[PDB]
Amino acid sequence: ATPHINAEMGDFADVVLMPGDPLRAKYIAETFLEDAREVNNVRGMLGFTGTYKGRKISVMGHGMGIPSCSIYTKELITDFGVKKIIRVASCGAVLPHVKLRDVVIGMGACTDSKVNRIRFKDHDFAAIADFDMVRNAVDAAKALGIDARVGNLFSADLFYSPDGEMFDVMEKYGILGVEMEAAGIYGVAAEFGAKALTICTVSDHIRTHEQTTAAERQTTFNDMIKIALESVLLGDK
Amino acid sequence: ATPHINAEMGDFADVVLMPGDPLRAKYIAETFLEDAREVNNVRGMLGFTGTYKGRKISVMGHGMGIPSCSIYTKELITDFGVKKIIRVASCGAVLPHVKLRDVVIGMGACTDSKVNRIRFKDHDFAAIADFDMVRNAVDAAKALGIDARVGNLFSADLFYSPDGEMFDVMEKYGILGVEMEAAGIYGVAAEFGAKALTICTVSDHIRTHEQTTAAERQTTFNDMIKIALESVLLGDK
Amino acid sequence: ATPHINAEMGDFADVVLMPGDPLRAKYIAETFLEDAREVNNVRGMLGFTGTYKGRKISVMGHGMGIPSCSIYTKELITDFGVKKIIRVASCGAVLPHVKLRDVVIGMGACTDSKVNRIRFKDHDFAAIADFDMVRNAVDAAKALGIDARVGNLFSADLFYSPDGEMFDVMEKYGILGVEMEAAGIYGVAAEFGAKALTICTVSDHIRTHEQTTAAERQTTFNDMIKIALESVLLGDK
Amino acid sequence: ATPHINAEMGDFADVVLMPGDPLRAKYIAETFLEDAREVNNVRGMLGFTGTYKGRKISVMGHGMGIPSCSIYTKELITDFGVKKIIRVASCGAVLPHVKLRDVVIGMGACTDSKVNRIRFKDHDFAAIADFDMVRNAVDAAKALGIDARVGNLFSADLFYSPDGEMFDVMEKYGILGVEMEAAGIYGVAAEFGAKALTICTVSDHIRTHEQTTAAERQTTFNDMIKIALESVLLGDK
Amino acid sequence: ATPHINAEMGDFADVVLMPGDPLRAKYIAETFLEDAREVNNVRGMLGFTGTYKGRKISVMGHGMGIPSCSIYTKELITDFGVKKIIRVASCGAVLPHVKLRDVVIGMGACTDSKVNRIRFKDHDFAAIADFDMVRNAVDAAKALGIDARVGNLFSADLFYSPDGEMFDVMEKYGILGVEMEAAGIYGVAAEFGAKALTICTVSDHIRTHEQTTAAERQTTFNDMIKIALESVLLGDK
Amino acid sequence: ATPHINAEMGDFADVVLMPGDPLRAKYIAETFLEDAREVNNVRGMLGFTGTYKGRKISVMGHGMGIPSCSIYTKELITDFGVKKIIRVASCGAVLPHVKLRDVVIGMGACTDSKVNRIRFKDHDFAAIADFDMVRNAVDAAKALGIDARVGNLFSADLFYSPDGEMFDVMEKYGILGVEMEAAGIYGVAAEFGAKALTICTVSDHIRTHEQTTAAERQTTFNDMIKIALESVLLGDK
Ligand SMILES: Nc1ncnc2c([C@@H]3O[C@H](CO)[C@@H](O)[C@H]3O)n[nH]c12
Ligand SMILES: Nc1ncnc2c([C@@H]3O[C@H](CO)[C@@H](O)[C@H]3O)n[nH]c12
Ligand SMILES: Nc1ncnc2c([C@@H]3O[C@H](CO)[C@@H](O)[C@H]3O)n[nH]c12
Ligand SMILES: Nc1ncnc2c([C@@H]3O[C@H](CO)[C@@H](O)[C@H]3O)n[nH]c12
Ligand SMILES: Nc1ncnc2c([C@@H]3O[C@H](CO)[C@@H](O)[C@H]3O)n[nH]c12
Ligand SMILES: Nc1ncnc2c([C@@H]3O[C@H](CO)[C@@H](O)[C@H]3O)n[nH]c12
């Protein structure tokens, strides 16, 4: 066991899908995995392992923010033999042409967190996904007939930002979605020697204030999950 | 309701105790509150409202890290009329004279997060508790026969730090405990005009294994909760 | 002797009161202390040691700014056995509910100096006073019929700041008074393991500009010194 | 004409290959392009336009360093209708398993330059290539039977770095090649609304001190050029 | 009058000499100036105005540190028509070829203060003296048979720095003397459109520690003042 | 030979004039030097060595930007015995009183580059010229009947700045000219123990179009070169 996960080596698959919400992890396990068993509930951070089309797969929540997801991803990598992390989540859009429920794939993640500066002697670390994983997700999406944009996410420390003008800067630089984890997960993957990808569904628009409900985010982002799961199968081949 | 809390105005008391673990919020409500009812379960972040010695009190988890607790504390203050937040958590010690099971009260919180620099034009914001709340907690501890230590916490973004050298720096400058939230909560309190306090119990020494028993650790945890609750009664008058 | 203090161990009390204006030290010695003796004259920074109600107390100016007061406070702590420093000064106010002649006690001190970032590996050190000293001052004021406000000061490097907009930021975050020393003194206290407190009287309101009499100013200054001295006696118990 | 390019709209193809060395641009034009004509020689920064397998293509030097290449790429984008920039260059390796003449494709570029912080309100901008361009280069390489790694480059401001320890940090974080332009080109592409990719050939090893000569770099990195040119043809389809 | 100078326009010459130690102002006035009159006494910072070989000159201490000298130099320039400020002080040396009692002229001043970053949008402002003033001082020294070294000073915020290794960095980059004011004075001069120069005599060698006589110190101090005064006359032509 | 210069020790004089444009290095050699021979052509960065009034002198382009000129200046100093570098360039003006065709001598150079912070432990290094070289240039200009202005340059990383607000800041703090190299050259000179100076002619006003003729601009450029060359002769004695 690790300080935040009460499980043993072998309980997790070598690939783990991770939404922020543990209730969404539960939904994914019930809806997409066969013979799913619960493998963690420490701090209510539910994790499950089962199979998808014969392939062993785990799904576990990571909580909100870089510090939360950094703990869970680290522990999975160092103590549970996890090789790939696929974050499956929600984000807010800043671009006019990005719509609710659009799927975005974060090949890179910008951030206002200090965690990567702490790692990288206060220089600019480009927090990037694993290329093969990105390509796998793009291909899986195309096969499912689901549109997906590939580009930069922005991982925010403050959901309620006191700097509204920064959204104009994100928009200027083509940021596809604002979320709170990607740059941290990519930093952990680099630090601890694993591979990661973040896929998000646009759950709200930062400009229009249109948004999905809590229940919607928990149990209604299915296209993203299919993309993630099918992308793993492509990577296996 | 807010995006992260499915409740309405009035469902929370004007004071909320907040552990990081939602299962610990349930623990506190069941152990210390009468007539407690669950008032939130979005993302599994359990919140409850009940009475302590006739006084309406809420308790709700905040999750791990500054970005997680910043979401919940902001929402409680701006949308649920909450006037006081008391974080009740665990911390690690760096000072040799600070022992396992000491109760630490964070009058200030240092941090390696960028959130307060973002708020404060890249200058140094001293993230501080409300003085009257600190005084109420110190007095409640004294009434219970406990000598709390009052000083600085350090709120870390990385539980698994790559630095390591920073622990010697914390020790040099007298930091009493290392946790992951206080500086963020204090920043939110200042930004939105409310009051906050963090109390922690020392759960480990970034150092040896000083060795206690489960019964003793659990007793001290309960003492921290009693301190928090009694401090509210003192503040009321 | 030290580079800036021509005295020997024992010449200073373990508690030193420090005004910014060196002329105030002699005034304090003659007005409040019994049997005062001169203990320093280097650079005209006169220092005196005497008793207040039998308790050994010293007084010496600190000069304007963090670098000046950092020199004197360091030397006092490391070479003269000083345990407590109480800065007694003036500040400017940014909050409209904070009035001329109000007494402000700096439990914390924000700053635009780099000195604490230099100490603390470029992270945020919360520059804080000693809690008991804060509470002693509050209690001493109350006994004198004075209601002190306790909160954050802002310690400026530039009295004449080219960033006028920073005062609005200070106001938003609840800064009680603007001065030029507290964060530096608190940083030295932490670095060398001693205790400090800054008490200020509001001499100006930054935005507007109202007026006061010389007699009103002396009365208020005397009140602050009385608070400081009585607070020491409470600290001794 | 622009301040650093004496040409007119239409003189450049919508895709420009750019090595740092203008003499290499000359070599590429002579060796790979048909009917090549020189279109710029301001400051000796040679640029040419011709065809590759019927496709109009330009090649022009960009000079050494972020500030130099930022000028040329900006001007091409804003005044010459250039849609894609493919940097074709050299880099130094830090990883043990990366060998001389290996081809590396920079999906991302880390940097110690301040240029992207200036663009991005002092936050972390992940300087990334266009995904389709990366995928095109990977596919072209596979078709040519040439191995290519995809990952992060590091764009240095100082070729002669006073901080040798930073190479250990680059190695730790899996940096594939150290060069001096990629992060700047990616920043310009984002700022001015175009697409970019950097492909490099390992010309020296920072640890082993093995290196290619000046003449070698100028006229002997042919596999990289074929990859770049063939990748354009794939993008056209 | 200004907040720190109780004088009116015309009371100060257009050139002011400023030692750090306020006691030195009266010494300079009595020793070098004719017909001196007292023009300030606020906070014991005595100021005087007289003539040297018929030329109107003022002298007043500036206190220790950038924040102190920044207050006085600003007020002198904006409210008293002062055109030139010459700081005359002491410094510590890090270069072994720089000896006790050497005269150093700061054409530039490095710093670890944040004041110039605050002025200059967080970029690097090169804090420099006025060139003619530098050359005047060099020429005045030469006429007196003194060979002054001209180069960079380092203006420290912390006389007691916790970063001992910075002295090695200063040595490597050719810093001639360490003091606490020059960069601040040069920043004020640029901000308010005036001219400044810092001249220092080496009082200590940071690494080692050799000795000197009181008589040697006064001789060297007098030499520095003579250089400063004669340099003004050269500047007038 | 070095990686960027194909020459051997002795091929360069101990003083090298450096324009940004290699074609301008050829211009200078042909116009002002006798018996000039080309000594470098790697990357088209032409360098030449000849005599001026019997004195051995070299001239070689440095390319645009701090990173480019830092490579060439370092190599000249460490591998070719070069003792003095004189950059001879163009700059843009921000001050209304600084006119087209003024000759500006950079005693200091401000910058938005990070290179000197990397050298100097993230503090402010005042990037300065060699005093004797500045004095020699001023004297040579006077002998030729030109009044050079001596002050700060600003060395920009982005010729095409997204800021724009920074030009007002430069004007406020008295910057004489904006170019792209001086601060980097001065940093290299300090790091490797040599001497440097930057002289520029004002080619544009970041402001209007003041309007000159080609003949007049070219005359002033030649005057700058004459100043540089004659200054060397003065330095020799
Ligand atoms: N507009 C927005 N801003 C920031 N984060 C989010 C999210 C994601 O959802 C959580 C906050 O609601 C957190 O995990 C974040 O990654 N959805 N919409 C967002
Ligand atoms: N040594 C330590 N370091 C960081 N955080 C913690 C904690 C707290 O527990 C959580 C991480 O386990 C987080 O909420 C933090 O505040 N206990 N001990 C800690
Ligand atoms: N509005 C203001 N801003 C900055 N400092 C002060 C002070 C104090 O007075 C001194 C400057 O006049 C300095 O020691 C500072 O702490 N009073 N009012 C102030
Ligand atoms: N070890 C190394 N470090 C930095 N840059 C380079 C290069 C590239 O070559 C140029 C410097 O030689 C410059 O354009 C840079 O991008 N090759 N090898 C390099
Ligand atoms: N080694 C040293 N470090 C810092 N400052 C000084 C000084 C000057 O003396 C004062 C501190 O003693 C201050 O004004 C500073 O400019 N002399 N020697 C010094
Ligand atoms: N307004 C301006 N801004 C930046 N650089 C320059 C220059 C110089 O010319 C080059 C850019 O054209 C570069 O070497 C720089 O130093 N002239 N005018 C300039």
Numbering used by the authors:
A (entry chain A), B (entry chain C), C (entry chain B), D (entry chain A), E (entry chain B), F (entry chain C): 1 to 237
Tell me, in the authors' exact words, what the paper reports.
Purine nucleoside phosphorylase (PNP, purine nucleoside orthophosphate ribosyl transferase, EC 2.4.2.1) has a crucial role in the purine salvage pathway. It catalyses the reversible phosphorolytic cleavage of the glycosidic bond of purine (2′-deoxy) nucleosides, generating the corresponding free base and (2′-deoxy) ribose 1-phosphate. E. coli PNP is an excellent molecular machine conducting efficient catalysis of purine nucleosides glycosidic bond cleavage. It is a homohexamer, built as a trimer of dimers, with all its subunits having the active site in the open conformation in the apo enzyme form. Monomers in each dimer mutually donate two amino acids (His4 and Arg43) to complete their active sites.
The crystal structure of complex WT-6(P/S)-6FA was obtained with a higher concentration of FA compared to structure WT-6(P/S)-2FA, and this resulted in filling all the active sites, including those in the open conformation. Difference electron density for omitted FA is best in the closed active site A, then in the open active site B, and finally somewhat poorer in the open active site D, which forms an open-closed dimer with site A. This is backed up by the values of occupancies of FA molecules, which in these three active sites are given as A:B:D = 0.8:0.5:0.4. This suggests that in the wild-type enzyme the active site B from the open-open B-B’ dimer exhibits a slightly higher affinity towards FA than the active site D that belongs to the closed-open A-D dimer. It turned out that the conformation of both proteins with all the active sites occupied by both ligands was the same, with a closed conformation in one of three active sites. Both ligands are in the same orientation in the active sites of WT and DM, and the conformation of crucial amino acids is very similar.
